[PDB]
């Protein structure tokens, strides 16, 4: 790849009391043209790990393929649930791929988020992994996962990598991150986490031209990786001055 052509905009991932909540609008744009409006941008790596991306879609699909087969081979050698690769392992692997490609001046034009649960003590999902069946879609309750057992990593084009309690990509690094550094807190419930993520996505919808309001939410919890039903985010303007007709303003001068 020589530059972005088809791109996704921004991803938000935060720890809350039951695991990881990661969000991305389902949009991939061809420049300023919103060609694809139903694109999946958060992928499941294993029952405890997800991958989100911004930037070029083809590079993201390549990386998703790499990780899919890495998880398959991991399962091929597994003899106990502890053998499954952690989110930290996948974050290291992706950071390494990016570093190697930087040294060749051949990067993937992506920013990546690797998030998940960094422990095996909260459930027995990795005892019998199902690649092609999902049993969630039984009537059990989520386990509270200690923040230290959760992992959210970031990788950029130059191989810069780090972890934190909340990670953002793209325009979320300005709009969402400001509100998160102001307002995020530990052990949030699903309701509070969802409310904060929705506020961030609403600001992005109002201020990022590449964004959309069709939001995909994914959760990684004691029940595994869960894709929520995509939903349209209601975004109303926050001032009546926007809606005031121009003809009611003075006709003279630069009134617009």
């Amino acid at each position: 790849t020589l530059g972005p052509v088809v791109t996704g905009t921004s991803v938000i991932a935060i720890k809350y009391k039951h695991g990881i909540m990661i969000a991305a609008d389902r949009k991939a744009s061809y420049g300023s043209y919103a060609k694809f409006q139903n694109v999946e941008r958060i992928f499941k790596i294993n029952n405890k790990t997800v991958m989100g991306f911004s930037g070029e879609l083809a590079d993201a699909q390549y990386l998703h393929e790499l990780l899919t087969r890495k998880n398959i081979n991991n399962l091929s050698e597994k003899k106990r649930k502890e053998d499954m690769y952690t989110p930290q392992h996948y974050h290291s692997y992706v950071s390494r791929v990016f570093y190697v490609r930087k040294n060749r001046i051949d990067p993937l034009f992506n920013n990546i988020i690797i998030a998940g649960i960094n422990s095996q003590k909260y459930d027995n999902n990795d005892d019998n992994v199902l690649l092609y069946t999902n049993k969630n879609n039984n009537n059990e309750e989520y386990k509270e996962i200690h923040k230290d057992d959760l992992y959210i990593g970031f990788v950029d084009m130059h191989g810069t990598n780090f972890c934190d309690d909340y990670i953002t990509t793209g325009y979320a690094r300005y709009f969402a991150l400001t509100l998160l550094r102001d307002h995020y807190k530990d052990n949030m419930t699903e309701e509070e986490a969802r409310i904060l993520i929705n506020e961030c996505l609403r600001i992005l919808y109002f201020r990022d031209a590449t964004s959309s309001n069709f939001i995909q939410i994914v959760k990684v919890t004691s029940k595994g990786v869960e894709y929520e039903e995509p939903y349209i985010l209601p975004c109303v303007l926050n001032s009546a001055d926007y809606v005031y007709p121009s003809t009611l303003l003075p006709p003279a001068g630069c009134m617009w």
């Binding site: 106990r80 930290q88 290291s92 692997y93």
Partner: protein, 239 residues
């Protein structure tokens, strides 16, 4: 003349690979080593070969990684090549993934290194066996053979006249699980002593002993501690 034992790629009419079996035969000629494990610990003990009076004893056990060590029997240079390979695999895994390698994967890679040397006429099998002791979520002992097979054990011994040590280990296998680290060390040392020649003894010079466990990185035992353990073994052997 066998007529089938000349090349390493030739099966005999009975379906055997004689060159590989000879490489295994090289293992029985080495000095004895014993590995045993409790619920939390693996203890490795082996005899250090001494060439003559003025010579220093040969090294028997080697550190591979923080929580992995090995003992070997057979051709020393082969063991050194394998030791370098394992150390490099572990360090490269730490470098790439920032975590300690999975011991099963490392042992499988070692066994595949073994296997690759048996399928071409221009190679020979490694003429050495590796006893591998690690703690990765649990204590573990592995063995690797020249033919490319590996096995996990609860107690293990090989080398010259290791059948006596094996007899001792089979006898007391039931005990090892629940016994303390001191008791486990005494058991390993007594099993090793069971392989001794008539006139020989176990001394700080000729005895290699390492422990590795839950909070206990691979560590050889010092001369003072080793001497106290050997004295305890002698005294409770007199009984």
């Amino acid at each position: 003349r066998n007529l089938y034992d000349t090349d390493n790629i030739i099966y005999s009419p009975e379906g055997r690979l004689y060159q590989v079996e000879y490489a295994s035969e090289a293992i029985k000629q080495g000095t004895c080593a014993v590995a045993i494990k409790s619920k939390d610990y693996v203890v490795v003990s082996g005899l250090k070969k001494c060439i003559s009076k003025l010579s220093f004893p040969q090294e028997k056990i080697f550190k591979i990684d923080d929580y992995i060590g090995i003992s070997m029997s057979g051709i020393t240079s082969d063991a050194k090549v394998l030791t370098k390979f394992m150390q490099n695999e572990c360090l490269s895994h730490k470098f790439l993934y920032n975590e300690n390698i999975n011991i099963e994967s490392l042992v499988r890679s070692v066994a595949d290194k073994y296997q690759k040397n048996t399928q071409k006429s221009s190679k020979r099998a490694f003429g050495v066996g590796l006893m591998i002791a690690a703690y990765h979520n649990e204590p573990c002992i592995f063995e690797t053979r020249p033919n490319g097979s590996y096995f996990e054990y609860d107690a293990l011994s090989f080398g010259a006249r290791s059948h006596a040590s094996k007899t001792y280990l089979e006898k007391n296998l039931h005990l090892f699980e629940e016994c303390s680290l001191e008791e486990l060390i005494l058991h390993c040392l007594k099993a090793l002593k069971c392989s001794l020649s008539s006139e020989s003894e176990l001394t700080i010079s000729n005895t290699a002993l390492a422990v590795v466990g839950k909070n206990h990185p691979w560590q050889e035992i010092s001369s003072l501690q080793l001497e106290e353990y050997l004295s305890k073994v002698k005294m409770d052997a007199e009984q």
